[model samples]
Structure formats: C-alpha cells, structure tokens
Target chain A: DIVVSKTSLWKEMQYNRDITIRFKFASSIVKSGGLGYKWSEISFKPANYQYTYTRDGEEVTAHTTCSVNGMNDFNFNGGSLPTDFVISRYEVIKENSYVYVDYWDDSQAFRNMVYVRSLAANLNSVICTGGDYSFALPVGQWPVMTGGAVSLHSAGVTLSTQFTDFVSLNSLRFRFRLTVEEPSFSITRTRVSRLYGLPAANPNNGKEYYEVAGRFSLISLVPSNDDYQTPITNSVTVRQDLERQLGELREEFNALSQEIAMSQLIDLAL
Target chain B: EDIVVSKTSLWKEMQYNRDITIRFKFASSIVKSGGLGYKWSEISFKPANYQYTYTRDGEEVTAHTTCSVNGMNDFNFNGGSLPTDFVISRYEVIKENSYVYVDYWDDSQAFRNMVYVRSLAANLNSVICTGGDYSFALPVGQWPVMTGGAVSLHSAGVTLSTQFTDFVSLNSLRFRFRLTVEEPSFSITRTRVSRLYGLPAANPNNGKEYYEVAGRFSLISLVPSNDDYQTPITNSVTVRQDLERQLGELREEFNALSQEIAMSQL
Candidate 1:
C-alpha cells in the first residue's frame, strides 16, 4: 500500500501549458519495541515537462490543476519496503522528434544519475536553448523555481526538506536535476538458503542447507505510504511488534524444507 | 599474067614425098593493077592425098589416090604494092602432127611460136607464090660440153641477215617466229635477249652501253657451213664465234634475272 500528495503553484491560466510534477516518499516508521522500522525522510525532485500545447484565447481565466496518483508497492510481501527507488523524469525535447529522460536512484549508497533520450524519437529540443514563438511550448506551464518542500512526521518526530527540480522543459531547452538522501533506519543483517534430500545408509544425515538468520526491525517515523493513518515510535516498540511474526515465518519455512527433503528421500529409495 | 595450076592435081602429085611450088603472074593492066602499091594481107597453102568416087555407066568407080593439103602458111596484107610497098604484116604456118605448132612474125620482126592465129589485114588479095625448096636436118659435130656449178644449200638456221630484218621489224616478227620455234623446241632463248645480244657492246668509256653486265659466255659452236659462211674461214668464223658468245651471254643474263626474281619471291 502507498500514499501520495501534490500541489500546484499557479491555479489560473488554463489551456494546456507545461508544469513540472514531482514525487516523494513518506519518512521511516518505528513499531514493536526495537524490531520493526520504516523510513521517515522524504526528498523529491520534479519530473521534466513532457507534453506540448498552445493556450486558447479565452476571456475568463481558469485555474490550472495538478493531481497525485497513489504510490504502488512492487514487492510481493506486504511488509517489505522498496529500496533504491526512483521516479522517471521526461522532457519533451521536440514535439514529434524526441523526449529526454533522467534516471536517478535515491536508495543506493551512491546515487546514479543518467541522462537518456528516447532512441527512436527526435532530440532537437535537447540541442536548442530558448523558446521560440513559432515553436510549440509544453502544456500546463509550471514555474521551475517555485521553491516548494515536502514535510514528514512519525512517532512524535518530524522531518522536512525543500523539493528540488530534477528536469526543466520548454519548446527548445531541457535540463535534469537528481536528488539523493539517507534512509531513516539502518539495515543490520540478512540470510538466504537452499535444501536437499538425505542419502542412503545415513538415516539421521538428511541434506539440510541453511544460513543463520539475521533480521532487522523497522518502524514508521511518520505516516507511511503503506498505511497513511498509522505512526511508528522507537526501535524496541518496532521489535516487539515484528519479532513474533518473523519467527513464525522462519519456523514455517524450516518445516516446509524438512517435509520436502523427506519426500525426496522416499522418492530416491523407490 | 595468070598461072593457074589445078590444086587437086597438084596435091595428088606432091603427096608422095614431093615438095612443089606454083607461081602466079601479076597483071599489068593499068586500071586493075594496084596503082599506088599493094599490101599482102594473108596467104595459105597445103597438100594431102585423097580418093574420089563417081558413077560411070551405072557402075561405081573409086579413084584410089588424091593429094590434099596437109600443111599451110598464110601471109595477109594491108594496102601496098605486090612486091615492094606490100608489107608482110604477119606470116603463119600450120602443121598436122601430135601437137599443133605455129610460128608468127609480128611487125617488129620478133618471132614466137603461136598456138593459134588471127589476122589484122583486111583489104588486099594476099597471094603467096612459092617456087622454092624447104628441108630440115639435125646438125652433128663436137657438142658443147656444159659442167654443173657447185651450189650451196643453206641449213635454214636463222641467219644474221634474217636476224637483222627481225630486229628492224622491232622483233615483232622475231617474237612470233621465236614463239613458234621456242615453244615447240623448248628453247630457252627469247627474241628480246637475242636482239640485245646481237648488238655490239659499247666500251665502258664510250657514251653508249649495250650490255650492263659482262662475262665470257659462249654457246655451242655452230659450224660455219659452205652456205652460211660464203667468205673465207678466217673472216666468217670470227663473226660466227662472236654471235654465239653474245647469244650465250644474253641467255645467261636472262636466266640469271629470272632465277633471281623467283628466289626473291621465295
């Protein structure tokens, strides 16, 4: 589950003009007494303007509107957090020619910033520098230096940062900006394993492969995107809330491996 | 005067190996005689023997022998006197034999044997008087001995005189003759070369040059026969030798040029 929020700088002046759209994540959470955790710090840079249109000459001024689509978790398990997440940014370099995009990852130890253009489209806008009156401008024009910020609060702690611009767009010009920040909680350990069946003449010597399990606890420092109503406090509270559940899952996995190994040994004997 | 002898009786008397003449007298009548003179036109006389048959008392009596003319001579006259002014323009004789022979005298006194006779005189009465004897005999004594002279028969070889004529005719005749001679004889010599060789070669210093190249060349020596070399030996032999040498040289040069042309083509 996830949650998102958006704001527009200019509310009037309608008829399809370009505007930057930005994306950010909620801060970490704390729960279950030092075992569970979530991220709290939220930082985002604006996506580049991507479409082009001309404003119609109308007498009445109407407000421009911006909306945020809800976040989505790509992970299979309900509790796992997305790491090294990225928001794709695109600028309409030329209406029919090409679009330029910036790829940046924020969760990695070192951020990777890349400028990529649509291979099959024209990139004349990336090469030209200024807007021309004859040229079609991006729809929903948005001021690039508006200086907006995202705020987060969880377990009686609050964090906030200014929203940065990641890309700029016009009829003939484009630039990219990327942002990277630290996660609120630390990741301590992880484990992985595989299992095999026992051989003949060794009844107790079943083939069992395992790694000693190491685990981490996460808690929300603010209202997380997964559950926007809940708040998380300290590490201990997070541990108490998460340990029983993790231990039960571990036991279920070990039991399933033993059953599977025993059934393979029976198959070998046949 | 008239002297009339019967011709039939005189012919019978003279038939047997007898020669007789009858004389006739000229009239002296002034008007009848030829006054200015008379020319003899023509006269003839002959005698032969004959027999006559007649009926006597209804019985046939045949006379056995009668003389007739066997030979005759005629003298014709134009206007002249009988002996002096008269001209014997022509005299003719006829004989009966295996072949007919005649003798004629023309006005020039020239005589020839005529096979036939005609007369030109038309007017005078031509009478001939014959009262003389005529005889013929072959004479015998030392006959004149005649010797046959030595005559030469030529070999008919082309002689220098013939060759000279040949050259003067620009050897057109020579060319034709040589064609005839050489074509059949397979002779290699040609008329052009032959004519060239026949000329005398001029000296080197002299203005004319007869033959361009020279060497001692000779033909088979042609023997000078009595006919071809009519002069003495020493004189004619030199000429013969020279001609043979010259012809040989010409033949040699012609053959050399022919062979040279053939070889050059090859």
Candidate 2:
C-alpha cells in the first residue's frame, strides 16, 4: 500500500529532520481479560532526540534541532494530556564522536561521561563513566539531577554537554565500534514510605504508590563526512558515484538470477 | 432456308353417336294410415310398361311397351293418426312386358326386404283369409269403408271404424290404367282416390262429400319412328341388338315372376 518509486532514492540528512512520528492513544480505558482495574496510569521515556552524522571520513557539525512537533500524545483515565508528552532523558553516541544531549530532564543529575568507539564495519560502541548523566529515562519519572519528576517545571535541559571527548575516524573502514551502557537503580520501602503513605488512613499519602528505576543503552556509527554534507558540485561527482552504485546493483541482480536458474534446473532433474 | 408447306384438310369427320331412351315400372304396395289395427290396406301397381331406343353412328333403335302403369306406386305406412309418426316402408319398381313384374321391397322394414325380380306375380293373385272365411282381397279400387266416421283424406286424415260393418278386407288389390306416348320419351300421370269423406263446406254451410286423391305415375315409354335411317352402324348393330334382347328378357321374366308370387299368396 505504500509504494516507493523504484527509480528514485529517498534521502534525509538527519534522523528527525524529515522524519515524522505519530502516536495514537485510545480515548477510553479498555480492560484486558482478567485485569483487576482499568489502566489509570502509564508513561514512556526519552521523549526527544537530536541526530547528527559524518560522511566520507569527515564529521559534519550543525546547529541543534528539536524533535518533530505534534508527534506524541497520550490518554489516561479517559483524559488526554494538555500538551504532548516528552521524555526525561535521551542520548546518541556516534563512533569517534562525542555524545550529544539535544534534550534532557532538568531533575536528573549528570553523573557520567559517555564515549563512542567504532568496532567492525559500520558498528559502534559506547563507553561511559559512573559520574556522567548519559542515560535516557522514561517520561514522568524522577530525574537523576534533582530526584524530582521531569515536568514543565524543568522542561528545557541539555545533558549532552556532560560528554567532553570526541574522536573523528572512518570507523567502518577501520573496523571500529561503539557501545552504550547505564547502571540500574532501585527504590527502598523506606523511600516509598517517605514519598507516599504506606499505611491506610493517612491523608497526605494519597498521591504516589509506585516508582520505577532503569537505564539506557545504544551503539551506532556516524555517517561519513561526504554522506553528511552536501555533495561537491552536485553534478559530475554525484553522477559518477551514482553510476558506480548502479553497476554494483546490476552485479547483485545477475548473481541472484543465476542462483534461481540453477535451483530450477535441479528441480527439473529430480 | 426454304419452307415446305403441306396443307391437310382441317375438317375432321365425327360420328354422331347420341341417343335417348325411356323406361317405365310399378310399385308393389301403397299404405294409408287410419286409427284401427285392421285399418291397413295393401295395393299393387305391376306389369309396368317401358319403351326405349338409341341412335349410334347415325343409326337409331326404337322400343315400346304394350302394358299400363309404368311402375309401382310409392307407399307411406303408419299405425297412428299422427302424420309425423308415419313410416313409409315399401317402394317397388314394376316393369311390364307380357305381364307385370316388380322390383319390390320395404326399405324401412326391420330387415331389408328381399327384392323379387322374376317372370311371375306369385303374391298378388291370392285371396288370403284372416278368420271366419273373410277374404283378404277386395274388388279393384274399392277401399274398406271406415265405420267410426268418414274424415277428409287431406294430410294424414282417415276415419276409424267404430263397428265392423260392410267391410271387405283384402290382402292386395291392383288398379288398371294405360300409358302411351308418340315421342321418343313421354310421361304418364295417374291420379287415384285414396280416401273419401263428407264435411261441412264453409261457403255452402252444409255437409258435402270431399274425396281425397293420390296418384302414381311415371314415364311409360318412348316410341321412336321405325325408319331405315334409324339402323345402327356396322360395329354398333350387335351391341344394339344385345341391349334390346336383354331388356325384352328382363321384362318377360319379371312379369311372369310377379304373377306367380301374387297367385301363390292367394
């Protein structure tokens, strides 16, 4: 149903530049079979991110951009959010490039520094220190910065500055890689008792009853400099590169045709 | 091309072979209706005379009869006074030579009557008796008088006898008449008194006898001129003679047969 023209290629410079994400939530609470109650509360993390890339062994840097607008909404207890939901924390580490925090929760503390290293053939790795706040978290959660819920109170924050080291290299050709890792956390019963009243008939304890703790992990390679920036002289070099890519595709097609014909002949012999 | 024109005479010779003839005969019985059981009568017209001749190939033959009553009378029979219920049974054709002979039978009888054609009148000459020595044959032309009263014979009217008085019952009766013609074919008309009665005439205002009449008549014969030009041509002479001979023989035998049958019945 969604047909892309075979004769054309779709190109976008950044992941969130031309991409649009849409979320739809039901208008009413639907009870699943055997569930005790209707779904009264729900949330998700990492509501936003900024994308960058390198091309032809060169890193192309540009101004920060926000996630595409009007891409997120939610319904809870038959009521919808007044504004779109946003993730509390998010990060992207490209091989040989420093970590970038296009957006983050003001409540979470930056406790670690994250690094990127190219591994093998288009793969990357992320290495982080314990003090760096390099991880993403679910939306509506208490941030590591201040142990408070990340809401409109501290909606604008940048945790990408926490990472200081950046390396530029042709990681795919050099067989380099990247990794992303974060530590896990848990809330004690005492912490829960302090936030919400555990015993019954406590007037001030009616608000919160549960808490969540988790980490974020990702490993990705940056685009080459030539792929990231506008091609030189857009005409002759781009046409030559396109011709070479077409020749490789034609070779692939011929190889697949030979394999199919050989299988058919084997079937005929049988 | 030269045309050869050959002309033959266009007038073809034709033989005149046209002729005409006449014949005569008599009926065996004539019935009239009345109201009583003994009120029936049987009558005969026999020995009918016929004459015929033919011309063939410019030649002619002539024939004639010496007797009267050319053929038998037609009879209508009934046992009731109603005219619609009348049954006409016997129709006879009688020819005459030396005597009378009949081709007679009742067509409406339960079984078809056998046609008696011979040289004698065996049934007509008898005087049959029913009982008390009463004769069946009455005098010629004398009908048995009804006793109840006389009624006009027009339509189917006849009187019934209330008492047996002066009634002479007869089995059969024959009336004599004559037929003659000067031409090759001519007809004979015979009228007879079938019933008699007295009735009040409207004009006179008095009773007068009114006789109801019926007649039996036919073409007697045709007497052609006896001349030498009437002779048949060569091939037709024998055929003419044969027809003449057969007609003469049939007449003679029928006459004798009718007489014999009439006499034996008496």
Candidate 3:
C-alpha cells in the first residue's frame, strides 16, 4: 500500500475578527430574496478590541485604532444609485480582494467568505453592497463602505485630498477617513509575524503585526456620535453606554499617538 | 483472408505517451438568408485505418467502420479521399454557423476507447473574414486547395486568412497541415457543398444560397498524447495469426483421428 503525508495549523491558532457595520433606512421595500432602500443618514462605530501573543520570547499586547471615510454625502438622489453591486473586504495581509456579487434577474443573491489584508498600511475603503457593474439601468448604483484602516505604527495613514479628488457625488461627494490608534506599549524588534511558526527577524525597518477586517451585517440604526458636545448622563442602554465609552477611549488614544509622533519629530528637527 | 486483428501491444508500447498527429478535412459551414445563415457541417476526418472493440453492459460492441455522430462510436477510417463528417450536438440552430473539430485515440490496450468530444466554433464574423472582399466562384465540381495558412479567393485577388492560429492551440498545430490537401470544394448545384460555406456570403436578392471557400482547421485533443481510430479496418497480421493458431489446433485433432484409424486396422 502507498500513501501521502501532510499537515497544517488549526483555526484556533489563527486570529479572527467579525465587525458588523449596520445601516439605517428611512423608507424601504422588502420582497422575496430582495431588499430595496432609498437613503438615510449614517455614522461610524469602533471595534474596541485587543490582541495578545508571544513574539521572540517576550509576551506582547497590541490594540488597533480604526478609521474609514467614503460616505461623506452618499444619497440616492445624487444621480442614480447602483442597480446591481459587488461586495469586497480589504485584508491586513493579502494582495487582491475577491469581488462578490450574484445575478439572475431583477435582483441578485450573494455572499463573501474571504478577506484581503493590508498592502501599504492604509485601510482602503471596501464596498459593502452587492450589484452588477454592467447592464443599462439608467443611473448606476454606487457602493457604501463597511470598515476602516488600522496602522500598527503610531504614525498611521492620513487621508490626502488627492485620494478624494477622483470620487464625486451629484451634489455633495466627500471622502470618509477613519484610523485605528496604534498600540501604546513599545515594539523595538524589526521582525514580521508568521502564520505557522515563530516570528523571524526581518531586515525591514517597521515591525510586522497581524490583523484582518470584514463586514458582519447591516442594522436598522447605530447610536449617534453624541459625545463631542457633552458628557451628559442621558438615558442610554448599557451596551450603548459601553460602546460610547469605548468610542471616547479610541478618540483619546488617537490624539495622544499624534502628539507623541509630533514631539519625536520636533526633537529631531531642533 | 481474415484481416482485422493484430498484436497491438507492440504498437501501444511504441507510441505510448508520445504525441501523434491525425488528418482532418473542413466540412461545410452552411448559412441561409432566412434562418440566420446555414447549417454548420461536421468537421470530417480522413479515413481511419484501425478499429477498437469495447464492451457495453457485458455485451461485446465493435465501433463502426464508418465515422458517425452517433454516441459511443469510433472514427473509423475506411479507404477514401473523401473525409468523414462528425456530428454537432447541443444547439442545431444553424442559420449562420461555423465549427472546428477534434478527436482523441490512445495506443494503450488498457484504455483503447475512442474519444471524439470537444469542437470549437469560429462563429459567423471570424469565419467569413467579412471586412474585405472575398469570393467562392470555383467550377461546380472542383474543390479549392488551401495548402498555405491563408487561402486566396478566385475573385478580386482577395486572400482571406482563416485564423487557424486562433482556432487550434500550439500543441495541436501540427495536425493543421493534414487538413490542407483535402479542402472541400465550392459548388452551386449541390446542397452538400453548401455545408462548406464558411466563407460564403448571403445574398438577400434571391432566395437561393451561395458558397464561398475559407475552411478553418484546429483540433481539440482530449488526451495529451495517445494513439489511435475510425473504421473497423481489421489488422491483416492479427487475422493471419488467428487463422494460423486455429489451423494448428485442427492439425492436432486430425493426427489423433489418423492414429485411431491405424490402431483399428491393426
């Protein structure tokens, strides 16, 4: 008898994150295997998560500050919304993301199973809807966003005007920018994280970190970003309160990281 | 005079896993003015030399001596310059149609089944080479030979190239030359000739169909490199060996009868 031998890592060792981005619709229609919504106001929420691992013999804990921007002025009345659409999730460590969309008749059935990782440290805005980019449907349907970017380094990627110039709306098209605050603890080694075995020393300047992002589902509404004005003790659910507190913590983390990066730059220049 | 069986193990061993080329001829690509164009005729094969035998539900079934569109039949190469035609399944909607043919045979005795599956369509636009002037005005009985990669029309000095390079893959290109010599001729009176209307242009003025000659040749081989099929051409060596074996057995029985006769007389 003859046979072949093989082995692989288990799912538990591999890290995973499931972040749900919900949308609110004012007036919408639902049919068999289809949902059509007009337009409504929107906002972004935080994942408020942490990851810990053993790198080179030292135990390490890391947190991500996330950012996403695209829904600056997304409205159905712009010109014509997309009739058919495709969904894609950018990853924290992969090349091209798979485009997901299905079609048969007036509607489409679709799902996404994989995620693409970070290419250059920018959280590229991935479309979170489904439709075909083909067929003559008067005004084309546009894609809404789902997730944001998270940088491992304190100096994360910033949204430049050149990035937003190409994207336009009928009346008010603007770019959405969101970023994940990098970890506060020190990471001195120049090595990349490996999927299977130990972390090897890398010749590159920046140290490597592992992370992934994807869409979970759409909800009717998300709690408003009501903290910029006051620390008011309004009647809010415990989950909403926790989410608000986490949101406030992320904002503070992001501001502190920027201050640290600027002071280090000032010390060098002076 | 038994003529069809042979010791194929040697031939099978010799050509095992080796690339082999077979001959083919372009069938008519008929198109009509009424039904889009005409019937897409079968891409025919040159006469087959050998035949294969297989079992169907434990019953011994021999492949046909002649090529047929019938399922589970061999591309039997009988002796003839006239190439054999294959059948097209699926959509028979041949108003303006075109086709390219391919087949597979192997030398291994363990697997001697004839596989004549995939065929490619050059479609209406590519087959006609319609952007320029072309012609099919040959004499009624004569077929034009396309010895080169491209064919020159009888009229207006227009040389239309059948994109054989596109039709057949690089692996199957060697089989292209065998098709050149037996190119189907153009005819006005014969509807059979109209099947070779790959380069034919439709005339709306009269209801009758016309013929032009631009046959494209490419093969879609199933197995990478395998031997062998068409007609039930019996191997002469095999038949002879079979007869010799039978004769030897007969001689042994005759000798026994002679001994018995001698003993009884004594």
- The best candidate by TM-score is 3
User: Residue A254 deviation, candidate 2, in Å?
Assistant: 99
Candidate 3 has a TM-score of 0.18
TM-score of chain A of each: 0.19, 0.17, 0.21
Predicted candidate 3 versus true structure: per-residue lDDT over B80-113, tens digit per residue: 2321221121111111222222222223231232
C-alpha displacement of B208 in model 3, angstroms? Answer: 23
Candidate 3 docking DockQ: 0.00
Tens digits of per-residue lDDT for model 2, A27-113: 111122112222222111121222233423543332221221111232212223322222221222222222222322211111111
Q: What is the TM-score of each candidate against the true structure?
A: 0.12, 0.13, 0.18
* Candidate 2: docking tier: incorrect
DockQ of each: 0.00, 0.00, 0.00
Better model by TM-score: candidate 1 vs candidate 2: 2
Give model 1's docking category: incorrect
Worst 10 residues of 3 chain B by lDDT: B158-167
Candidate 2 local lDDT, B18-71, one digit each (tens) = 122222222123333222212233443322223344442456544322112333
Interface RMSD of each: 93.6, 73.6, 47.6
Ranking by lDDT: 3, 2, 1
Following a full C-alpha superposition, what root-mean-square deviation does model 1 have from the true structure? 81.4
Q: Is candidate 1 or candidate 3 better by lDDT?
A: 3
Q: Worst 10-residue stretch by lDDT in candidate 3 chain A?
A: A102-111
True contacts kept of each: 0.00, 0.00, 0.00
